[model samples]
Target: HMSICTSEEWQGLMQFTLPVRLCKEIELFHFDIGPFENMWPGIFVYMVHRSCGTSCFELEKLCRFIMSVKKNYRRVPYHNWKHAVTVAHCMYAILQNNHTLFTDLERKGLLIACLCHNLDHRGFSNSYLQKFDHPLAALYSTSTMEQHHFSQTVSILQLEGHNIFSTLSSSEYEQVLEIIRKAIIATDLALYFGNRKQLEEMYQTGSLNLNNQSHRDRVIGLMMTACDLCSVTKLWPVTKLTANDIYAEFWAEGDEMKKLGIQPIPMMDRDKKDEVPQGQLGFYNAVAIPCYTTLTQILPPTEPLLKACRDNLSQWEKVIRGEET
Candidate 1:
């Protein structure tokens, strides 16, 4: 018997209804809007609707579930509802543009995982939590926050009325949850490097096959990470805004570490602000560029990601050389 969220638990949450105009806009823009504000719930539902048809009951339950999930995000500097929605939008954009690449279940799982990837984040890194012996660190033992985020997602799904997958067959439900788990955990940067290497090797060897389930799953994991860090491949203003928010969160964590007599990483140290451009340049060179480049190799339609990432990399390079000043 699947446990689910009860009706009473959804009371006092904001009601959600997808506006026809906004639905059309999301389709037109391919879900690339910024700071959806109060629009996340509708946008999420709209994507679900677009990907797979849902019954009225399921739609209402899903709306309430998203509202609950949104309320659960902490009021942090980043890793909040805004970031989650942005990640989801990126996933939606990727799926919209490359719809034929994924099945309905895979597409649905990716979008849901993106929306839930950073749920209940504390704006701190795994190292920070482990260093301080945080409770979550003890609970998870590894991939601390990523594991916690997935757990929170499961808990929400177990709420009386929140099991949006209740209508799915038992096997389908299990498969979706498994995909969501893999996708969410893949958002952790620690796991990203390994996945990227494996995918890149396969792409280079011409062994990348969409028909193989394992290969497809691995690629989906990479896709999740790509969307998680999609801001790096966004246009200049979007990239700049996202970088500022991310650094603000990092500096806050650094401040906390400082008070505890611990030194934060160079990128996190507020006093070393001047090094940000160079750090970003290194990140793009080492992580963002390779990840997107490999993805475009597997899916040619995703070339936009590689192109935009390189464009942002050029801008970061100029900033590092003091040309932007």
Candidate 2:
């Protein structure tokens, strides 16, 4: 009874199947590789189909929906489809490694949330939106991009033959949508600080309990943050490449601001390129370290992330010190 896209309609447009070697690699390395576009949609289909016991018709709809979602992302340096895939892959890796960490709903929500988190990003920050009096700023008043991303998700779902959750019971469908909203919004780094603070306190006091649903949900939100910033926990080459792409995006935004006679942040200002290492050092210290440390405290399996971040931090420090000399 559910509407679905026919095979002919879905053909030649973002159609994909997971490669055997890539599947092996994802398992072996915990999804540490650089982005591979062809594999993400297929992997998403495989995971969701397996988890939800979806039918072939539903899978086709899901794949088409994901393809449409990927197309919606702008061609920005960092916040494009590649970045979305990387975040989703990180979530997939986390769920795979920590089998007991999340329920079926949580796992599905986290994966989908990552894929949808930055849809239609314009290579600008929330501050840029507010400063320019952008309509999204007027509409959201806070977490502008995050809310827009969720709205886009809903819009995509309502499109013909695109409701991947159509087969679910009414209550189940509502729960999934709610979880998706919360998980997507958690990607806003501004919200991350507060979530990290709460999680860190619970972790330090040894009062963290996964059995409690509220506690589990809170940790899942922090996990979304961890996945959003997963580049900081990757190998140095990968981390450096991602950082360059991000700064390219940031600098483009800076250039636009400059045209409008506005001063950009130190990190975003292309004229201050020499300060990149210093900015990275601050980011690693203030954002990445606390995020990974708090996550590892609750989920010991994520300790490797903390170690990788520390190594990246030390490398940044060396770079900054060398520049100073």
Candidate 3:
């Protein structure tokens, strides 16, 4: 399991690397993670800055500014800084191996998209947008949840949000928008039903054939999905952090369900004490990990990460079976 970091530890790391302003933003976010405030957002931001460069000052700044706008909004567990950094880190890892897949223009788009995809996500799934008739869903009727997010992200980017890309040239800015759209759309898990299945079906046929395809689309798709399915591939420390984020999101959704008097998602049903791991670990093991493992096998770079996921699964299995603490 991931251990939370102390304020001093975070401050020490930030002092050595980040600008004072950026570090302060991270510190503020650290205090917002509730019981695990010390453990999150800070650690993940450290990793994001490591990958994106300290110049990623805008990323940190905008995230902080967005969160600061509404106290209620900041409580969105999945859209918090921790999830942002995790996606950014996953994108970083995917690019390490497949960097050549896109032109510089596309890469910028992908990076920005990965960094800002869930700008102010509530813990609930996309289905809730439809269920509640959210304005965002109505406004961006043509878009997926990820696309709506990118659009909101762009709206913010145009205001104070633009500072994140203020240093880029106009041409670079255009390129980044194009790339971010593609990357963000890829975040919609709905794509897996069609796009990913084509590849999965091929895999089942005993033919590992993506050889004839251009590197660009495949690479972009892979990187996007990798980020989306990152938890299973993350290192143990990162995975534990992600797990906490997931649980927090689950609880938040549970609260919403109570107020709306709706039948909650399984894990969100607070009264269901009989639920395995209160329906938490089961979702992780059954839904999240299995989906990630399938994706990893298709993308060879993720093989080692998939093995790590399997190891995590076994560990969770032990927890479920009452075999270990």
Candidate No. with top lDDT: 1
Instruction: List candidate 1 stretches off by more than 4 Å.
Output: 1-32, 54-57
| lDDT, candidate 3, 55-146, per-residue tens | 65565453443333222233565676656655665665555455554455554456556666775565666777667788877876544467
TM-score of every candidate relative to the true structure: 0.91, 0.91, 0.68
Q: Can you rank all candidates by lDDT, best first?
A: 1, 2, 3
Q: Identify the runs in model 3 with alpha carbons over 4 angstroms from their true place.
A: 1-73, 142-144, 160-175, 202-219, 235-241, 273-298
Of 1 and 3, the candidate ahead on lDDT is 1
Q: Estimate every model's Cα lDDT from 0 to 1.
A: 0.82, 0.80, 0.57
Residue 206, model 3: Cα distance from true site in angstroms: 9.6
Clashing residue pairs for model 2: none
Q: What residue runs in model 2 are displaced by over 4 Å at the alpha carbon?
A: 1-9, 12-15, 28-35, 49-57, 323-325
Residue 94, candidate 3: C-alpha displacement in angstroms: 1.7
Clashing pairs for predicted structure model 3, backbone only: 109-180, 157-161, 157-162
